[PDB]
Structure 1
Amino acid sequence: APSRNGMILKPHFHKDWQRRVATWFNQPARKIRRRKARQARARRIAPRPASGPLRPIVRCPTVRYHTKVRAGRGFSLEELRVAGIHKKVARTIGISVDPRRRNKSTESLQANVQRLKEYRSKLVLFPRKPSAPKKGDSSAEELKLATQLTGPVMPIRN
């Protein structure tokens, strides 16, 4: 029964909720586990960025977010076509590619081509064998860095 003034309030504890309470005593143990697993994955992908692949710049949807810009899922095909990277290869050099992205405006396209161009400049493709063929960079830019890149690769700053 209500007594003199207060929010006529509806709690949702009518089902058997104590049967499905989910505690968080994991979380520290979890946080570590992720972190180990993270450091392992770095070490496996030895000079490759820990991050992942490079990802496009992309505007959010809706009037609300609109003004901001994130990393997207992957670079469109037009953006790869214009940059001149064969889509099947782009995956092999650490360039995210989605193929479901349309491309409406040319301002978002040329920006994302520029991204890939810049990436290709500051990328150090190792040759397949220690014996060096084409494409593969010099042993100077190799000895001076077989270095991983900490954090997201070429980060987007709005």
Structure 2
Amino acid sequence: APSRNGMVLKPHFHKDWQRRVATWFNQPARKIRRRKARQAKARRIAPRPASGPIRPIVRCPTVRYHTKVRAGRGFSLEELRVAGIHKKVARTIGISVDPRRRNKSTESLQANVQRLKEYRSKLILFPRKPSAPKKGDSSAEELKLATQLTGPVMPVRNVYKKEKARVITEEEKNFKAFASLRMARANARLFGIRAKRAKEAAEQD
């Protein structure tokens, strides 16, 4: 079968694929199902925003993506506890709750507490009975719009650094190096044996 110069092609068509093929001609219909599903979700609720649970702020776990940031799933129980509010109180406020999430980094941890202080500043709620506890006055006709768009706070807003200008100094262009990667990379590979070779040097005696 093969011939003059061409690439080896191995397609996966020995398996009788024509019985099992999903065809996307139902693609405009579901798209109109789903706008009319979100808009049916829009006019049920009330003043509360669609996509209304607020999400936390989470850095992306790898070496590849950890220089960007992402709306996670739920505020940490210990994050949310620094704001001081109880668990199932908080979901009625409209905050997402996640028990699985730790907090190793207080720069991460306090950044979400600032976000909850933001949202609880942001919040205009309504009571059942106007006994005036954590409630709102006649407030900007339900604050000028009932519903928000794509999260309440624009969760990405990925923060950039300027560090605008500086003079270059002595002893940085004198000392820094390529080689202080290579010296340190080779330092890490030999920490085990350099510990042991000197340990059996003094164990010899």
* C-alpha contact 2:83 2:117 (8 A) present in aligned 1: yes
**Secondary structure at the counterpart of residue 70 of structure 2:** strand
* C-alpha contact 1:124 1:141 (8 A) present in aligned 2: no
* C-alpha contact 1:127 1:137 (8 A) present in aligned 2: no
**Secondary structure at the counterpart of residue 101 of structure 1:** coil
Structure 1 residues 114 and 100 mapped into 2: Cα distance closer, same or farther (>3 Å)? same
* C-alpha contact 1:56 1:71 (8 A) present in aligned 2: yes
Structure 1 residues 23 and 146 mapped into 2: Cα distance closer, same or farther (>3 Å)? closer
Give the alignment of 1:34-73 within 5 angstroms.
34-73=34-73
Structure 1 residues 107 and 87 mapped into 2: Cα distance closer, same or farther (>3 Å)? same
Percent of residue pairs identical: 96
Query: Quick one: higher RCO (CA 8 Å, sep 6+), 1 or 2?
Result: 1
What displacement does 1:105 show? 0.7
What displacement does 1:142 show? 3.7
* C-alpha contact 1:124 1:137 (8 A) present in aligned 2: no
Question: Could you tell me how far apart the structure 1 residues matched to 2:141 and 2:109 are?
Answer: 30
What displacement does 1:52 show? 2.5
Question: Could you tell me how far apart the structure 2 residues matched to 1:152 and 1:140 are?
Answer: 18
Residues 13-62 of structure 1: per-residue CA shift (max 9 Å, x gap): 11110001111001110011011000111111111111220000000010
What displacement does 1:132 show? 5.0
Q: TM-score, normalised by structure 1?
A: 0.87
Q: TM-score, normalised by structure 2?
A: 0.68
Residues 71-91 of structure 1: per-residue CA shift (max 9 Å, x gap): 001000111110111111110
**Secondary structure at the counterpart of residue 26 of structure 1:** helix
Structure 1 residues 146 and 23 mapped into 2: Cα distance closer, same or farther (>3 Å)? closer
Number of residue pairs matched by the alignment: 157
Structure 1 residues 116 and 133 mapped into 2: Cα distance closer, same or farther (>3 Å)? closer
Matched, 1:152 2:155: no
Question: Could you tell me how far apart the structure 1 residues matched to 2:147 and 2:28 are?
Answer: 30
Question: Could you tell me how far apart the structure 2 residues matched to 1:45 and 1:54 are?
Answer: 16
Q: State the Cα RMSD in Å.
A: 7.0
**Secondary structure at the counterpart of residue 117 of structure 1:** helix
Larger C-alpha radius of gyration, 1 or 2? 2
Structure 1 residues 41 and 67 mapped into 2: Cα distance closer, same or farther (>3 Å)? same
**Secondary structure at the counterpart of residue 133 of structure 1:** coil
* C-alpha contact 2:76 2:99 (8 A) present in aligned 1: yes
Structure 1 residues 144 and 18 mapped into 2: Cα distance closer, same or farther (>3 Å)? closer
Question: Could you tell me how far apart the structure 2 residues matched to 1:125 and 1:107 are?
Answer: 30
What displacement does 1:129 show? 3.3
What displacement does 1:134 show? 4.8
* C-alpha contact 2:54 2:151 (8 A) present in aligned 1: no
